[PDB]
Structure 1
Amino acid sequence: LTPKELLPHDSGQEDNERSNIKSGKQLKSRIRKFFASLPSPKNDFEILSEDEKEEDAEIAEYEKEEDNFIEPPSQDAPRVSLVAVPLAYSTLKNNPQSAIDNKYNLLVANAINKEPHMESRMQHITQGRTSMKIQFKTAMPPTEVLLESIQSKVESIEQLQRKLQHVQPLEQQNNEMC
Structure 2
Amino acid sequence: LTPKELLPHDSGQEDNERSNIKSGKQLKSRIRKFFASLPSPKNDFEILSEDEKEEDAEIAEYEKEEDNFIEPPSQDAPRVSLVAVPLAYSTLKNNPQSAIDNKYNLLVANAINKEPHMESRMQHITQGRTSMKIQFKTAMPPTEVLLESIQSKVESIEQLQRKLQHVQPLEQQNNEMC
Task: For residues 96-150 of structure 1, give each alpha carbon's deviation from its aligned partner in whole angstroms, at most 9, with x where no partner exists.
Answer: 0000000000000000000000000000000000000000000000000000000
* Cα distance in structure 2, aligned partners of 1:138 and 1:47: 47
CA RMSD between the two structures? 0.1
* Cα distance in structure 2, aligned partners of 1:81 and 1:3: 38
* Cα distance in structure 1, aligned partners of 2:50 and 2:31: 27
Residue 66 of structure 1: how far off its partner (Å): 0.0
Pair 1:23-2:28 in alignment: no
* Cα distance in structure 1, aligned partners of 2:75 and 2:108: 37
* Cα distance in structure 2, aligned partners of 1:113 and 1:78: 40
* Cα distance in structure 1, aligned partners of 2:155 and 2:125: 39
Equivalent position SS for 2:119: coil
* Cα distance in structure 1, aligned partners of 2:114 and 2:44: 25
TM-score by length of 1: 1.00
Paired residues for 1:1-150 under 5 Å: 1-150=1-150
Equivalent position SS for 2:159: helix
Task: Flag as ranges the 4+ runs of structure 1 deviating above 3 A.
Answer: none
* Cα distance in structure 2, aligned partners of 1:50 and 1:153: 69
Residue 176 of structure 1: how far off its partner (Å): 0.0
> Percent of aligned positions with the same letter in both sequences?
100
* Cα distance in structure 2, aligned partners of 1:81 and 1:17: 18
* Cα distance in structure 2, aligned partners of 1:125 and 1:28: 36
TM-score by length of 2: 1.00
Residue 37 of structure 1: how far off its partner (Å): 0.1
* Cα distance in structure 2, aligned partners of 1:4 and 1:166: 88
Equivalent position SS for 2:76: coil
The aligned residue for residue 168 of structure 1 is 168
Task: For residues 64-106 of structure 1, give each alpha carbon's deviation from its aligned partner in whole angstroms, at most 9, with x where no partner exists.
Answer: 0000000000000000000000000000000000000000000
Equivalent position SS for 2:172: helix
